[PDB]
Design a protein around this ligand. Sequence first.
Ligand SMILES: Cc1ccncc1NC(=O)CCc1ccccc1F
Ligand SMILES: Cc1ccncc1NC(=O)CCc1ccccc1F
Lengths: 304, 304
Amino acid sequence: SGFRKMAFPSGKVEGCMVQVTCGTTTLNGLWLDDVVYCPRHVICTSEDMLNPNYEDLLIRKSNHNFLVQAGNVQLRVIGHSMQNCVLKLKVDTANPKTPKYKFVRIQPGQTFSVLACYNGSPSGVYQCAMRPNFTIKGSFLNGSCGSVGFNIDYDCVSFCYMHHMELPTGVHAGTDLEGNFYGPFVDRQTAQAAGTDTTITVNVLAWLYAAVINGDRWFLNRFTTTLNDFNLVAMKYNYEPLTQDHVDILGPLSAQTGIAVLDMCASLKELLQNGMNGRTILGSALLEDEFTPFDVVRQCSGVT
Amino acid sequence: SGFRKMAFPSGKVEGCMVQVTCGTTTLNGLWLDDVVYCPRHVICTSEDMLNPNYEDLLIRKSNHNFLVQAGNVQLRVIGHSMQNCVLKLKVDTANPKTPKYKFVRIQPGQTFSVLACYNGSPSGVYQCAMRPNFTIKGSFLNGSCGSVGFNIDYDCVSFCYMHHMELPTGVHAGTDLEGNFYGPFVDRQTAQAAGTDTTITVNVLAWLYAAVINGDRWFLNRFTTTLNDFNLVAMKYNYEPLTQDHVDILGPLSAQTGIAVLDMCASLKELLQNGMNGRTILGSALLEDEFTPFDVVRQCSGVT
Ligand SMILES: Cc1ccncc1NC(=O)CCc1ccccc1F
Ligand SMILES: Cc1ccncc1NC(=O)CCc1ccccc1F
């Protein structure tokens, strides 16, 4: 028992981190097989910041201008190409530490672990959610670009995020591993609107189930609700509308605890309307939405 | 910017995890050089649970009864000994993945990362604090015993915790790597009092500094206090009394932000006396005490 915001073990990803330098800019790259992936903005200088012409900037670069160092050994770059907002540097040596991996585009509301890196060296790991507005609230400083987000399914690493930007609001934006941004963001030093965000309802309900499993039950009540009634409350409080697909994904937690999904919705409705009353749930004084129903099941069953 | 409850990258520790089976019990062991460390209760059966005579239970075991498997390869056990509450199994092969390491006994209030494991396989990593009462609030299920806590200083892993028990209250207890319990706990299936816990004041202040650095400043006020006045409030609210050693450790954060430690104490005093008023600090609706001043500095500067 106990419930923590747990990240996946980062070892398989640590073995893929490299440093990429082009000109005076250094950031992180991900070395998988004989390719190093990194944000294309490694080719920018301070004057280019506002609206870089990446095609023209890249034309001024040759393979030998991309300095790739895997810890302390230098990689030989034999090709370079830009795919969306990422650069792919072909190297002459396959990473001996390449895990089984996939590139996936995650959905908003899904969670993943980030391995924060600086100069190709891992500094820490944390779990987070891709917000409904496609931003992430991470911990990134200058030099962290190229750090990646991922999930692990036993031996397979599914890479889902590569860090590119900090918006002027202090929230973060990045791409899938094909270089496509999540959200409306562009890799330019320009103020950019992140959409209206919402709280991930299905994750809050999953976390209320994790709370009941771990002994925090004070929020359970004598009520029930309907999806329609619950969605009026979700609307008022800027929560994602709950659908039958969400109720279906909560099936295992409802089956394990014996608390019907709509009865848990009535507990969530009461907490939204009345607050916590100075109490806590799993050590939090707010409704947590960074655990998916899969995360709760994995953590509550001991999956490795 | 942004501030997260970040764990150390777990790779160096993942390479040390093994499974240890003795009889019908399986738990995790830590393989460093040619020694595997694990909780001694791996030698218990269900009847022994209440008050095991570990010396007698261990006398019934030979080297060949300890089955140690490093992922999928079997280790040959050539010696066994009990040191306090840990067993040390000498193996004929040094772990090729042994990082530079130290065994340290952490102080209450210090933080560390836990790599939760089941059957010698890592399942997740999270950061936590050793409570002032020597318990930890982790996420551990049956089979997680032998999972370890650690800190990393560039290339050196300082192992500080090995998991042994879940108290009937759902909080966790364990030992240093010499097998000495943190706190008054014994490895028996008996209800055991954890002392009165307190909130780690110096960590809350460190986290208020991390909040100001990251833009959350609404809690700053026009007041100041003294250590004496602050400690009367700390007393009322079950916070650790603040000392000059704590003020000294907060020096770097005070210097960086320009907010004198006693002025931050006056913000903390007001938050204790008035609550958050439905507001948040770094995404939390409570005062967080699981970041030390060193953690804040490391995270806010980008240390790898
Ligand atoms: C400074 C920082 C901090 C944290 N995470 C990320 C960053 N870096 C950025 O936001 C870089 C912004 C940028 C500017 C010019 C061209 C492309 C581009 F993506
Ligand atoms: C069940 C569980 C869950 C999480 N963490 C740990 C555990 N396991 C325990 O508490 C084992 C308790 C014990 C009983 C008999 C002899 C020694 C001993 F330490």
